[PDB]
Ligand SMILES: O=C(O)CNC(=O)c1ncc(-c2cn(CCCc3ccc(Cl)cc3)nn2)cc1O
């Protein structure tokens with residue numbers, strides 16, 4: 581179970597338990613808790629330099645955004661196009677649409693749709709009213725388009741702190757700034773990203789379950805050329821242990837983040853994210869940085885994330901070299917069977 585869940589944190593002014601574990605979903609693997617530390621704490625600077633997850637609790641990274649809510653955003657964000665994904669269920673499986681023309685026989689069960697902010701809230705209001713079970717997840721990189729109040733907020737982020745982290749870790753350019761607004765219960769299934777991430781919680785509480793790259797074997801990512809590249813094939817809600825036996829060996833690092841917490845998700849680390857049930861609307865901003873460049877002459881034994889990049893590159897080479905990504909599997913199997921297995 582979630583031994584790493586944590587005894588819920590008690591909010592100041594004794595306004596109750598921020599959340600209780602009945603708002604966490606039930607899963608078949610154990611976990612240990614991610615450390616919640618202060619930014620000044622050197623234990624937390626060492627966790628980051630060693631690419632290990634840590635919850636930073638007092639960065640003020642997005643202090644101005646803590647006032648955010650739907651009303652405030654609607655009135656001040658502009659008339660921009662905001663990507664919004666629909667879903668039949670709590671699970672939000674996402675598809676790379678450009679990879680979409682390889683496989684045609686894995687149909688789409690979560691779809692994008694541009695909206696103006698007022699229409700999005702519109703949709704939640706009516707879904708709200710009719711008690712519907714459709715779920716929505718807004719996910720959009722904010723850009724200069726936005727309102728005057730929201731540019732001032734963005735400018736009030738603690739750029740000095742994060743910009744220092746980018747330099748101290750030798751990381752590369754901030755790639756993007758997604759904003760996520762999601763409904764209670766919504767789940768982003770387990771996946772890994774190729775970039776260092778600072779996951780900055782604003783409104784609501786999110787449960788984050790991470791796994792290290794070295795548990796690649798237990799999480800069974802889709803093929804690289806598949807639309808669900810970098811997602812785990814394993815249904816966390818009902819695992820198929822015959823197809824994925826080593827998911828019985830998976831142990832996670834877990835934590836619940838709330839307003840003001842910043843969760844460092846090291847690159848290539850798996851993460852599963854859920855907005856707690858009956859916790860209402862969640863709001864997050866993410867800060868993705870190209871990771872540090874790989875030194876010129878490499879140190880063995882390699883680290884797990886480098887082996888992952890290798891496997892990824894093998895799949896990519898073979899896809900181009902064979903003229904068809906769908907021959908990758910067959911060739912790899914003939915390479916292995918009775919030779920390496
Ligand atoms: O639900 C939560 O709180 C946690 N959600 C996530 O972590 C999350 N992670 C990754 C993606 C994602 C989206 N795309 C499509 C192109 C955008 C892009 C490009 C590069 C990178 Cl590095 C990230 C994003 N590719 N990856 C979406 C997510 O929502």
Ligand SMILES: [Zn+2]
Nearest residue numbers: 771772773851
């Ligand atoms: Zn991610």
